[PDB]
Design a protein around this ligand. Structure first.
Ligand SMILES: [Fe+3]
Ligand SMILES: [Fe+3]
Lengths: 132, 392, 515, 168, 392, 74, 132
């Protein structure tokens, strides 16, 4: 969810003993399946254009659970299901040659299953090769 | 220390950065962030190439397409305008329409040529280390390549200088860029021919890379008589900048030039065991095709089809083509006498081979240029006119 | 043979090719320049940097990669594009786009030098210069392109190639480093473009300005402009070679001092007031007084290292120098009066000098407070900044007899009743048209060469029209179609609109109707 | 009085309607020559269309050029002025004219009038440009002889201005 | 209003920048600003290549040249060390001594290859536009180039994969860089051969760029039988990482590889009218010479002349050379059977032509490698051994 | 033939070459890993980013130029 | 001289009326020949090394009149007669390929006659082709 995709969601809101009590709670001693993905874009002229006019416009239209946070040198993006960026759409926005490999110049990190397909970059919660 | 103040930087100095932060509004004062958003895009989206190039030329409304007004601030003695319509016979509804399909502003242009510059030197260092020059036919190397490819550098050099008045005279920014990049590519071709000869001289004792013999051949050998006459005319005999570009690239260089570089030296290199020359002609032929894309756009898309002046421009372009095609056919008729000096190779240097080379050159040209401006041409008639200079 | 060969690794360095370039030319009767020139002396000179096309591209691409790395990666991640003081971010709309046309005209001027050169090496060098001037055009555009993307006011960074046509300061920019190079003797460009333009004025215009940018928070402009000027040492060296050939020929040397003086005066006439105004009034933090920048770069260093050294060889200190030094001291303050009074015609947002600015102006130019200072403070009291005031100072100038004239030659505005710079008004009628000239050097140019100088001025084109209509017609508005690009303050609130201008009822007169 | 808008106005519209009536090379040549004598250069007969004449001139040029290509044989486009004169003869005549000029005042009017009469499309572009450059060479040389020799008061008289104002 | 703090930058935030400035000492705390100033420079002054590369490998003093101490933190089941002397027969006083004479750390390596990557696509777009494929000998194109040059990609690919254990096992940083760059250059060679075939397919209807025929020829045609046997052994039959590099680059590729790439496909392209293949072989031959410079330094300067182990190392290098030279001579004896399928060209494909080609390969190899390690070889004997497979 | 050919401008994009890379392996008995492993299952998977050597270099060099510009210049 | 080569030498020390009186003095209405050269180097990693280890060491020992001033984005250098920089000596200091063309990447401005000869860049007061 949108609230759950905040960087400081849930236990991250708590401080001091309140934080320790949940952090060491019995039920938080095993991992919990998450349907989210995390995408990190390092800041640059091209990426800042992509964030504002693609991820935060059509991207969030299609996936309202998207959260983008400012982390100084990078954008931290978390969303339910999957995040996609079409390099051809970005190249239209930038006015210069821009393949999917060019898009990767500033895609820094991914928590999830990432891959390219044509001009489009995708990071998805799906476990390809296991999920049917 | 130092005598003058060490200026504090507003970006990092705490006191100045705090003052700046207080002065900067907390919101943007407009939402229009597209540099020169009003340019009419040629393609589905406005390109950075267009954004950085288009309307840099400060033309007034009395030069078609200009957005400014009024006369120039200072003109030549007599009244010639800084830029003017008197510079060319051709007309258009907007001199800004031209777009290089390669979208070269300065940075991609030097980025690409730098790649070629550095890779060339790596290739030469390895080629000399390989010893591959050992299998080249020595007669080709010494009597045809060194002498007649050398002499060809003078044609490339003259076509380079043909662009000097074009760079001053032409009427828009995208055209000026196209012209200047074309000129550098031509002088690069001449320099690259000379580089290959200088390189061979390091590998072949007694091989003379002086330009003395190539220059004597260019200036006095009947084989290049027609080519030199045409080049001198295109460079120094006219000043209409559209005529220079058209006659230079779309007629003379697209027929004589392509025949000499690609049908003679590059093609016969791969019949006489020359593993070196194809590295160099790969560059001139890449440059020719890039230049062609931009020359094609200016003269075909823009001038030959301008809504108001397309047929008017075709009238001049057809008159120019008739004149300079005649000049180029004479140049090729002279040039094919060179075949009397090469070792016969069936399908390449005999009459059938040379006939097929001329069919490719005049046939390609009819498709690439003549058909697009309505210039009627009988390819077989041009082939036969050139073959009259072929020694059976 | 087919077995034995030297396999030492060798290539071919640029200077090995370059030594053969002189031989690439050949003799034929038509091999000579197309352009009118007075200079016909021998000019078979050697290029001082042995560039060939491949090495030209390698050098320039290496510069670019570093430059665009800093811009698109580093400075963008720092948010540097909006860390500029507003006065300076507004000043760069003008400096970069005006310099852009200078660089663009330098492409064409260098093509004339290419055409009139006779040595292959010099034709080669001028081509490299032609290329550099295209590079610099795209660099100046890239500055404003970057500001459009990253700075809090993109309007006017994003459309100066049309919105500059509205205003009168643009007219003189088309002469100073533009028409004044390309419309004239082609061999003379080695004197006006190069000996004067590149060797004298590019240093304060392109190098010294980067310190003002830095002082005011702008690290974009230093990143680009400092790279721009790296090309200039080749340009200056190209022209010096020709100057030598001119000096050594007695028939050609008898033209040089008059061409040098006319070039120097043409360039300084506009450069001195307009750049001094942009530096001092378009900054918050000042580096040094403009008149000192000018003294350092123009009078002492260019004047002594180029002109004073050449004086051993018959080149004279420009006779117009004294008049120019007076301009260096006061002409940019004179120009400020016109710039601020006519602010709606520009494409930048202006800031009246604040209290600490005024103290700095008076400390460095004693007399400023009692003349310019008192005027600016009266305009503020009348509501200069306030869109509801109905006040625009150009109409106030006229109601107190402070007419504004345009020089028919330089296009620089002149307010004779308020000016402390060099100038005096001359008004002539010739063949039914009235002309205003403003100094001895341009008046001679016009009297000798009227057909070179027929530039329409803003009062001639705008006569009798109301100010807001001219602005709207020239697209001097933000994307809402109503708020002016130009502003008389640099704040985010209370921006002026076309209706705010209209309420002032400013209509353009004919300044020469009274004669 | 009150100028109309810059780029679209009744003067330009009215001149375009006049140009639309030109139907032959001869008629358009007399039209453009008369126009350039009446409205261009410092020796023009009238400043009544000063802020529109350059645009109007362009529109006449466009009309004359299309009429040339529709009506004239190709060889006329290369070798003849639209006055019917031989272009090379025109060149030789005006170069000799300016080289015979006895002062910069004589030379300047010869150059200015050559352009009023023969600017393209009247003369072929190539011939015109090299003629204009040869003329400009002569004119520059004579003007740049003793450029500062005449005091301003003297230059004002030689030019023949009416001095309306000299600030003290 | 995002959920987490918008961190203030210490470089530009006034109050953090003032705290930092107060904390930074007013003077430097040492004068030694040369990164890893203690590396012994190979050349006049320490290079950035050496500074960035040297001693990145954390070897202890019990692997010759290591500066660290003690056992590894975690070893293989059984005790195999993370890196160890058991990895190779060769010995040295210092495994760090090797220096690539091209001084390639990762940046200059991809910078150069990026140049080749982008220029190659521009060249292909221009070459297709040029139509220059029209003069290639169709038999060469279809029966020899497509099939047997295609098949050669498997040799390049196998030599590429031979480096997998080398990248893991080898004992210093500069060696590891040399090996990995050599490996990418080999898989590039294979990919570039496929790129050329895919490109020709776009130009020649019915030309099949599938690898089915090449693969079948590599795996079953007698012409490549000896070559494939050798590659399989170097790649997967051994693990001594110095034996892989020596056999792969200094013996097999320097004789069979150089013959096939340079004496067969590159040379004969310039006898059969092939204006395309030289652009591709220009890259593989440039890559071969760059690789050779680094391989030469490791085996000649460092190992065959190591002050304590030079003769010891030559004992193994001689034994390896004897074995893999015999493997390569057999590979060449098989390969020259391909000449039975080509159109005859005097001086190129006749017995005198092939003999001179083998004299260049074996004679160059004797100078470039055999003489430097003391390996005796009779050039004429190896030439005649291969010519026994030549069918005249 | 010798006169007629398609002269449309074409290159070969990285994925066009990548398509054929799986076919570059060939079968021989000794074709298996040198290193000890517990894991012997079939593993004939596809690579998610279709990279070839030329495109690898182009991508990384572009990253480097931006990075070294920021460091050495700005 | 070193004192005369300071950016704020001579009249540049003066302010207000004192400056104006010298600025408008009769003797200062014509240029005065100068034997100096001015060299501007834009700041970069390579240039800063060159400044400290070449110009301010070997250069200044050779030419003690050299004055270097920090102008934020560039180094301002003024000297009597000539300034020279050897790209071969720079390449050794930098440890990377560095031709004279590479040297020019960050040489931003020149007041004086500039040229390259071999691996050396020179800016000189000499008027080549006029002086003997
Ligand atoms: Fe410039
Ligand atoms: Fe310049």
């Amino acid at each position: 969810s949108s609230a759950a995709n905040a960087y400081n969601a849930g236990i991250m809101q708590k401080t001091g003993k309140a934080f320790a009590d949940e952090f060491f709670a019995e039920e938080n001693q095993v991992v919990h399946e998450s349907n989210a993905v995390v995408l990190v874009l390092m800041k640059s002229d091209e990426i800042d254009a992509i964030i504002e006019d693609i991820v935060l416009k059509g991207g969030k239209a299609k996936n309202p659970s998207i959260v983008v946070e400012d982390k100084a040198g990078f954008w931290w993006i978390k969303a339910d299901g999957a995040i996609e960026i079409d390099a051809a759409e970005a190249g239209e926005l930038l006015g210069k040659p821009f393949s999917v490999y060019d898009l990767l110049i500033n895609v820094s990190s991914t928590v999830g299953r990432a891959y390219t397909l044509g001009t489009k970059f995708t990071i998805t919660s799906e476990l390809m090769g296991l999920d049917r | 220390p130092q005598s003058s103040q060490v200026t504090k930087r507003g970006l990092t100095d705490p006191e100045r950065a705090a003052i700046i932060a207080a002065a900067v509004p907390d919101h943007a004062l407009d939402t229009q962030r597209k540099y020169h958003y009003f340019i009419q895009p040629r393609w589905k989206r406005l390109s950075e190439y267009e954004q950085l190039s288009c309307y840099a030329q400060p033309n007034p409304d009395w030069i078609a397409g200009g957005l400014d007004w009024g006369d120039w601030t200072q003109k030549f003695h007599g009244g010639r305008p800084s830029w003017g319509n008197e510079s060319t016979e051709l007309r258009t509804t907007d001199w800004y329409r031209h777009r290089d399909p390669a979208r070269r502003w300065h940075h991609p242009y030097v980025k690409d040529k730098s790649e070629e510059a550095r890779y060339t030197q790596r290739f030469l260092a390895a080629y000399s280390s390989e010893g591959s020059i050992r299998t080249i036919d020595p007669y080709w190397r010494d009597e045809i390549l060194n002498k007649y490819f050398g002499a060809l550098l003078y044609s490339e050099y003259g076509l380079f200088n043909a662009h000097s008045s074009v760079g001053r005279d032409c009427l828009s920014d995208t055209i000026r860029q196209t012209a200047v990049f074309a000129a550098l590519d031509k002088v690069d071709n001449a320099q690259m021919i000379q580089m290959e000869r200088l390189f061979i001289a390091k590998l072949v004792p007694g091989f003379d890379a002086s330009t003395d013999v190539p220059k004597k051949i260019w200036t006095t050998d009947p084989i290049y008589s027609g080519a030199r006459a045409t080049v001198q005319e295109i460079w120094q005999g006219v000043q209409d900048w559209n005529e220079i570009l058209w006659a230079g690239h779309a007629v003379y260089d697209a027929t004589f030039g392509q025949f000499a570089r690609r049908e003679f030296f590059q093609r016969l290199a791969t019949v006489y065991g020359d593993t070196l020359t194809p590295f160099f002609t790969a560059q001139s032929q890449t440059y020719f095709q890039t230049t062609r894309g931009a020359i094609d756009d200016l003269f075909v898309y823009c001038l030959a089809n301008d809504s108001e002046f397309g047929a008017h421009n075709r009238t001049f372009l057809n008159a120019w083509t008739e004149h300079y095609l005649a000049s180029s056919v004479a140049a090729l008729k002279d040039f094919v006498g060179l075949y009397a000096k090469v070792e016969k190779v069936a399908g390449a240097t005999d009459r059938a081979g040379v006939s097929e080379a001329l069919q490719r050159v005049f046939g390609d040209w009819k498709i690439d240029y003549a058909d697009k401006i309505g210039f009627r041409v009988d390819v077989d008639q041009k082939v036969d006119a050139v073959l009259a200079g072929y020694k059976n | 043979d087919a077995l034995k060969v030297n396999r030492a690794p060798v290539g071919v360095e640029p200077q090995e090719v370059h030594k053969w370039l002189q031989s690439f030319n050949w003799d034929f009767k038509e091999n000579r320049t197309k352009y009118p020139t007075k200079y016909h002396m021998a000019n078979e000179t050697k290029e001082q940097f042995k560039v060939i096309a491949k090495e030209y591209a390698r050098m320039e691409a290496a510069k670019d990669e570093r430059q665009f790395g800093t811009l698109l990666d580093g400075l963008t991640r720092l948010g540097a594009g909006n860390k500029v003081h507003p006065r300076w971010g507004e000043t760069m709309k003008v400096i970069s786009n005006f310099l852009e046309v200078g660089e663009y005209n330098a492409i064409a001027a260098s093509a004339m030098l290419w055409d009139s050169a006779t040595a292959a090496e010099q034709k080669n060098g001028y081509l490299a210069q032609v290329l550099d001037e295209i590079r610099h055009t795209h660099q100046c555009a890239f500055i404003n392109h970057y500001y459009s993307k990253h700075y809090h006011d993109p309007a006017g960074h994003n459309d100066a190639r049309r919105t500059r046509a509205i205003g009168p300061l643009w007219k003189g920019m088309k002469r100073v480093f533009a028409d004044g190079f390309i419309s004239g003797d082609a061999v003379e460009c080695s004197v006006n473009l190069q000996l004067v333009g590149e060797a004298c004025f590019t240093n304060p215009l392109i190098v010294a300005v980067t310190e003002w940018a830095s002082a005011n928070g702008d690290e974009i402009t230093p990143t680009v402009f400092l790279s721009v000027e790296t090309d200039e040492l080749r340009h200056m060296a190209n022209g010096y070679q020709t100057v030598v050939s001119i000096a050594n020929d007695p028939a050609s040397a008898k033209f040089l001092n008059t061409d040098l003086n006319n070039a120097f005066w043409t360039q300084q006439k506009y450069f001195t007031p307009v750049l001094g105004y942009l530096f001092e009034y378009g900054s918050k933090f000042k580096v040094e007084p403009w008149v000192k920048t000018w003294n350092r770069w123009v009078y002492e260093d260019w004047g002594g290292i180029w002109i004073g050294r050449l004086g051993k060889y018959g080149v004279e200190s420009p006779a117009s120098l004294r008049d120019a030094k007076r301009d260096a001291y006061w002409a940019h303050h004179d120009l400020a009066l016109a710039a601020y009074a006519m602010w709606p015609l520009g494409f930048a947002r202006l800031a009246l000098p604040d209290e600490e600015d005024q103290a700095w102006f008076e400390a460095n130019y004693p007399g400023w407070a009692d003349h310019y200072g008192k005027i600016f403070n009266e305009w503020k009291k009348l509501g200069y900044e306030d869109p509801k005031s109905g006040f625009i100072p150009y109409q106030w100038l006229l109601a107190n007899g402070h007419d504004v004239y345009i020089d028919r030659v330089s296009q620089v505005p002149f307010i004779p009743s308020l000016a402390k710079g060099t100038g005096s008004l001359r008004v002539h009628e010739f063949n039914g048209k009235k002309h205003s000239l403003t100094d001895d050097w341009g008046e001679r140019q016009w009297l000798i060469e009227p057909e070179r100088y027929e530039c329409h001025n803003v009062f001639e084109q705008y006569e009798g029209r109301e100010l807001s209509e001219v602005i709207a017609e020239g697209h001097g508005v933000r994307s809402d179609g109503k708020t002016l690009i130009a502003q008389p303050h640099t704040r985010g609130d209370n921006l002026w609109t076309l209706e705010d201008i209209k309420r002032a009822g400013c209509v353009f007169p004919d300044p020469l109707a009274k004669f | 009085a009150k100028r109309e808008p810059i780029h679209d106005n009744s003067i330009r519209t009215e001149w375009e309607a006049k140009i639309a009536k030109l139907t032959s090379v001869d008629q358009a040549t007399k039209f453009i020559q008369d126009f350039r004598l009446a409205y261009t250069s410092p020796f023009r007969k009238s400043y009544d269309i000063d802020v529109d004449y350059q645009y109007i001139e362009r529109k006449i040029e466009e009309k004359l050029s299309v009429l040339k290509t529709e009506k004239l044989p190709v060889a006329d486009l290369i070798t003849k002025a639209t006055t019917g004169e031989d272009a090379a003869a025109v060149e030789a005549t005006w170069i000799a004219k300016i080289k015979a000029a006895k002062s910069k005042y004589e030379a300047e009017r010869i150059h200015i009038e050559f352009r009023q009469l023969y600017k393209p499309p009247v003369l072929p572009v190539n011939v015109f440009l090299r003629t204009d450059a040869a003329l400009g060479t002569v004119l520059m040389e004579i003007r740049n002889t003793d450029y500062y020799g005449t005091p301003l008061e003297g230059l004002r008289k030689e030019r023949g201005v009416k001095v309306l104002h000299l600030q003290a």
